């Protein structure tokens, strides 16, 4: 099991190291000071009241998610609900067709 984990791609492994799955990170935006602050969401800083940009910028987050999908390790990553990105089959199914497609 440990060997299989080690065999995972580098970026994914790094992510797991620095945001581990024992902590249930929040689905919604949170305080930046919070422990359960989602790195994919923009969390608000409590003093200044300014939204900090996500700790994992959107491309990196997407890459991480794709890696998780590849190796079946999605649920151990923190939730990507309130980040607007969907991926692959879920994206395909859930999306509404454009107004131009349905109503030319």
């Amino acid at each position: 099991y440990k060997q299989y984990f080690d065999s995972l791609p580098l970026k994914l492994k790094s992510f797991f190291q620095r945001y581990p799955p024992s902590i249930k990170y929040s689905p919604v935006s949170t305080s930046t000071k919070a422990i359960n602050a989602n790195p994919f969401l923009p969390n608000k800083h409590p003093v200044t009241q300014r939204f900090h940009d996500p700790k994992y910028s959107l491309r990196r987050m997407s890459d991480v998610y794709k890696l998780a999908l590849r190796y079946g390790v999605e649920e151990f990553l923190p939730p990507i609900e309130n980040t607007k990105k969907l991926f692959f089959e879920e994206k395909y199914n859930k999306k509404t067709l454009m107004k131009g497609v349905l109503l030319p």
Partner: protein, 220 residues
């Protein structure tokens, strides 16, 4: 002795290059083929410089436009398929359709299939194959010939990425552990084409979800 000191080119391969400015009896003597004394003698005028008259790239009006939205399909005639079958190169298991990927594999179509394949009817008389075909589209006559043979055509939509995936699914698996999903037709023209029963478009023939959704939207 080694052959290495007795090798010649094949007769008719090589030539002596015309060597100028190297004596009178050579032929290409002092003037070196230039003629005598003009601009072309010692300098450079352009080959297509017409003298000052309005040139043949100016007299005439500029015509047409380049349709950048165009995506030219590679044409495959029924005749070629028939020939392949006769030669026993058309390897198909029963039930397996002769798709664009399959055609490429076989060597029916060859070179890069960028946008798709159209099936044309240049040997529709001697076509007698009951196998099922699937391409970007087919000629009406070709379709009729296929039907007569006891075959079954389906015009299938493929975006360039989707087409590529279809042709070489293993590459995508190797790279990413997952072949990409086949796109819906976003364009209006594309939707219209595959919604035609006369074209044997996949949206009507398979009774697709997109078409139904469009109909529902129209109703509402």
């Amino acid at each position: 002795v080694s052959i290495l000191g007795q090798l010649k080119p094949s007769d008719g391969s090589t030539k002596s290059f015309k060597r100028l400015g190297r004596g009178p009896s050579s032929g290409l003597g002092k003037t070196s083929g230039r003629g005598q004394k003009g601009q072309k003698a010692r300098g450079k005028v352009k080959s297509w410089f017409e003298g000052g008259q309005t040139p043949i790239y100016k007299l005439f009006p500029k015509i047409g436009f380049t349709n950048v939205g165009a995506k030219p399909l590679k044409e495959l005639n029924l005749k070629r398929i028939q020939w392949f079958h006769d030669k026993n190169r058309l390897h198909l298991q029963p039930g397996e359709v002769l798709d664009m990927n399959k055609m490429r594999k076989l060597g029916l179509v060859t070179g890069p299939i960028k946008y798709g394949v159209k099936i044309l009817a240049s040997g529709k008389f001697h076509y007698n194959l009951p196998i099922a075909l699937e391409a970007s589209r087919a000629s009406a006559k070709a379709i009729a010939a296929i039907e007569k043979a006891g075959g079954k055509f389906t015009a299938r939509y493929y975006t360039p990425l989707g087409l590529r995936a279809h042709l070489n699914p293993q590459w995508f698996l190797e790279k990413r552990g997952r072949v990409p999903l086949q796109a819906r037709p976003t364009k209006r023209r594309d939707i219209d084409f595959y919604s035609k029963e006369e074209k044997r478009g996949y949206l009507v023939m398979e009774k697709d979800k997109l078409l139904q959704d469009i109909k529902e939207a129209q109703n509402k």
